[model samples]
Target: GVFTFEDEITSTVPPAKLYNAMKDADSITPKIIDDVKSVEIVEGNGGPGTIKKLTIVEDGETKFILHKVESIDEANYAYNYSVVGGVALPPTAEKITFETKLVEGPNGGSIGKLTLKYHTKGDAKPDEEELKKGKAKGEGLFRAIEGYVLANPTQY
Candidate 1:
């Protein structure tokens, strides 16, 4: 069965500024997050239908994810993507999807709507690690974006 979850992260960065940071995440992630080795385009031109590969080093073990760029809604400050293939997905898991939407908050700043979808092997759901993995992807990326925005206010 397919399992899905959603969450939100409130940030001090405004919607436009936060969205700008996300569009340039490929460049910012490596610089902001020490564990991330690099992010590069595997196909397309960084727009819709593009494919990106992000590599990271965790406790001496190198891991990577092949992320497919599904859509980018500039007007709505939303970017959607999915994890297609890589050694990161264990045998008990299938593909994972993510939706990142940044919107205006009631008292300034930006409210991020982070949506995650998970696929299991057959009808069996894996252990709790899968859910944590799903959350980690979104949280790490969110932190990377916020780190960049806080450090470089004028750029994005």
Candidate 2:
């Protein structure tokens, strides 16, 4: 069992843009997080069973090998992925997963909702400090992506 964390950010761009930007996570992560060195996809055809090799540059250079991709709905704009494997970090592995959805908002803009769920293995509770650090990392990633998209709308 693993505990999961969830966060969401609304982007000025549409769901399609966000989805496209995230399709290659390895590329977008480094741009947002200074600590991330590189992300490479090892196997699969961009759907389920796709393995992503992640190298965290700063902080400890931790490595994460994750798979477990489920269905992706282009119409409703939602996708789900789980950590089929990994190392380092608060013992978060295949036990954690997230589902993100992009939908139209009342203001005619797009509203993105990200939900995460997981169960820890050893019954160890993450410390307050760990939670804070995770929160900051998530915020930074979202801000970086949103900023990049806003600045380079034509790049996509």
Candidate topping lDDT: 1
Model 1 TM-score (2 dp):
0.91
Worst 10 residues of 2 by lDDT: 87-96
Off by over 4 Å in 1: none
True-vs-predicted CA distance for residue 24, candidate 1, Å: 0.6
- Candidate 2 segments exceeding 4 Å error: 1-6, 60-62, 65-67, 87-89, 92-94, 122-128
lDDT of 2 by residue, 1-156 (tens): 556566667767776776667665657778777777777778877786676676665556566645567667777878776655654245633255667788876665577787766556565665566457655765676666666777787876
Every candidate's lDDT: 0.83, 0.66
